[PDB]
Amino acid sequence: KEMPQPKTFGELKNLPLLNTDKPVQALMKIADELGEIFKFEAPGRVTRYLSSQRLIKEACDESRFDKNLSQALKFVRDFAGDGLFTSWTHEKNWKKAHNILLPSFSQQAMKGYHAMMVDIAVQLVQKWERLNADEHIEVPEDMTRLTLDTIGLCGFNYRFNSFYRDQPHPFITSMVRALDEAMNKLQRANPDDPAYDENKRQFQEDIKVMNDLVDKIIADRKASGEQSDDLLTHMLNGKDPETGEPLDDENIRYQIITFLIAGHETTSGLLSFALYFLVKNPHVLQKAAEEAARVLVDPVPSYKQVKQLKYVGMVLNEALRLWPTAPAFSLYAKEDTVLGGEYPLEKGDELMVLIPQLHRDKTIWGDDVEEFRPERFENPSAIPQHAFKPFGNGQRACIGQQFALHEATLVLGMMLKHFDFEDHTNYELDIKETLTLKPEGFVVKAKSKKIPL
Ligand code: HEM
Ligand SMILES: O=C(O)[C@H](Cc1ccccc1)NC(=O)[C@@H]1CCCCN1C(=O)CCC1CCCCC1
């Protein structure tokens, strides 16, 4: 069958469709119009966007397809290097780093990160306890303070001290401006127009800021000998069981930059969306708050208690269904192959998985796909294979999944234990797009229940 394609712009093909502040949402709209698969061309580029479980289940067969670096990831690679997120599966450092780091990101490993995750969570709760009666919370702003600080502390025992600032730490200034440049480059017609020379100079300066802080951190740890409960420790001492080799200091730097990227707004977005859905769905808020009160019986939550928050976990999954904060990933065909019995592909041909659209497949979820219903996830094994992919696919799935969900469950549980929430402005969802998604301008008021820490 002949593949549908959206509107074109003469010799720029489909490229100006991405010249928008909200490209994911635009692509979602195209999928609604065109269906489960459409072709997208640009000068020198062809991809196919997939939206249905039927076709994505095939895309997710690792014998047939492998992770591709999207143009976005190729631009992120200029500062994330051959870290896990921006390496090809066949590069030696991918499987080396993968083997070394997998045990440090397991569910068992979360027991050892718990104490420092509580450190930052308590900082958030204390900030909100200390607000005056008149005052509101800037939700994505505070969630990002929390998630960045947690990965800094758990990852390399570095305190960004985001709750002590209005101005982001200079590393985060540089990282955010670099991520912005990478996303802004995708859209651009004539990349080497003199107009973008300033952009390029700033890009190089921000890479240097990031490299300088992180390489100093790594060198300070090597020159101290100190052993922490952190990823930097394990990367400095660990050996890949397969090659017998450690990571070198340049790759360790790339992994740290990678983890700081993920721990920024990709993780903070999940919390911001979950609180959005909770204040728009009071009966769901009631259930989640009741669970928190019943389960979190101590001033300091334990690891075991966070595992006990089943309903809180269901809320977070349902927020990942509607607004997966890392909303796409890319694949390539390893050999010539036919997709869904209808769409012949050549070796090297690219696919893109539009995760928010996969998660609105009515043939899987039913017609009420836009509703916020945590009960969809009461039993994980009711969900068909390959229907729910907020953390990607296969050996190239998110290594930080257990970390992100432990942190999110802890924090959301403590927020629900300690405060009542009010959508005082009747907030209208407005999703800003960077590398990730977030509900821009989302504000609430938090009335303390006056329960001691
Ligand atoms: C809700 C929060 C998060 C979501 C939705 C998420 C989502 C994803 C997705 C969809 C991928 C696959 C990317 C692709 O195929 O191109 C991925 C990969 C990855 N994520 Fe996450 N992520 C989250 C949090 C984190 C955190 C907190 C970390 C680290 C501390 C992390 C580290 C990684 C790494 C290293 C990879 C590459 C894994 C590999 O290819 O070996 N992520 N993430
Ligand atoms: O990067 C790409 O080739 C294509 C866009 C593109 C560019 C040029 C030509 C064709 C398609 N990217 C995408 O389609 C998607 C959706 C729109 C935003 C960019 N994007 C992405 O995947 C962003 C990459 C990752 C970064 C962290 C995880 C979540 C997103």
Which atom belonging to ligand 2 lies closest to the Cα atom of 186?
Answer: 7
Q: Residues 6 or more apart from 344 whose CB is under 8 A from it?
A: 336, 337, 338
CA distances from 54 to 50, 95, 355, 366, 384 (A): 10, 29, 13, 15, 11
Residues in the chain: 453
351 lines ligand 2 (CB under 6 A): no
Q: How far apart are CA 181 and CA 353, in angstroms?
A: 23
Query: What residues contact 20, with CB distance under 8 A and at least 6 apart?
Result: 26, 187
Tell me the C-alpha distance between 424 and 445, whole Å: 7
Q: Where do we find the tokens 């450190």?
A: 119
156 is catalytic: no
d(CA 66, CA 274): 31
209 Cβ partners below 8 Å, 6+ apart?
170, 171, 173, 174
Is the C-beta atom of 392 inside 6 A of ligand 1? yes
CA distances from 257 to 159, 245, 246, 291 (A): 15, 21, 18, 36
Closest Cα partner for 148 from 264, 255, 253, 230?
264
The verdict on whether 266 is a catalytic residue reads yes
Confirm whether 391 is a catalytic residue: yes
Mutate to test the pocket of ligand 2, among 18, 21, 258 (most ligand atoms within 8 A of CB): 18
**Backbone torsions φ then ψ of 33, nearest 5 degrees:** -70, -50
| Token code pair at residue 243 | 């090659």
How far does residue 70's CA lie from ligand 2's centre (Å)? 6
Whole-number Å distance between alpha carbons of 115 and 229: 10
Collapse the DSSP code of 438 into the 3-class scheme (helix H, G, I; strand E, B; otherwise coil) and give the result.
strand
Residue that has been written with the tokens 């440049």 in this structure:
181
Q: Which of 102, 156, 398, when mutated, tests ligand 1's pocket best, judged by the most ligand atoms within 8 Å of its CB?
A: 398
Give residues after which the chain gaps, C-N over 2.5 angstroms.
none
Selecting among 150, 266, 267, 325, the annotated active-site residue is 266
Residue 421 backbone dihedrals phi, psi, to 5 degrees: -115, 145
Asked if 256 and 232 count as a contact pair (C-beta separation under 8 A), the reply is yes
Output b/e per residue, 406-439; b: 16+ Cβ within 10 A: bbbbbbbbbbbbbbebebeeebeeebebbbbbbb
Between the CA of 27 and the centroid of ligand 1 the distance, in Å, is: 21
What is the rounded end-to-end Cα distance, in angstroms, of the chain?
62
- Cα separation, 357 vs 328, in Å, equals 10
CA-closest candidate to residue 95, choices 223, 226, 241: 241
Q: Which domain holds residue 205?
A: 1-453
Catalytic-role residue among 47, 171, 325, 398: 398
Give the E-state strand segments of 304-393 in sequence order: 328-333, 337-339, 343-345, 350-354
286 C-beta neighbours (distance < 10 Å), count: 11
Q: Cα separations (Å) of 402 from 61, 111, 154, 438?
A: 23, 11, 13, 21
Of the candidates 65, 79, 273, 391, the residue annotated as catalytic is: 391
**Which residue has the least CA distance to atom 31 on ligand 1?**
400
Q: What is the resolution of this structure in A?
A: 1.5
Strand ranges (DSSP E) for 232-358?
328-333, 337-339, 343-345, 350-354
Beta carbons of 178 and 206 less than 8 angstroms apart: yes
Query: Would you say the CB of residue 12 lies under 6 angstroms from ligand 2?
Result: no
Contact (Cβ atoms closer than 8 angstroms) between residue 416 and residue 89: no
Q: How many domains is the chain built from?
A: 1
Q: Is 345 helix (H, G, I), strand (E, B) or coil?
A: strand
Kindly state the tokens that stand for 384. Answer: 């068909």
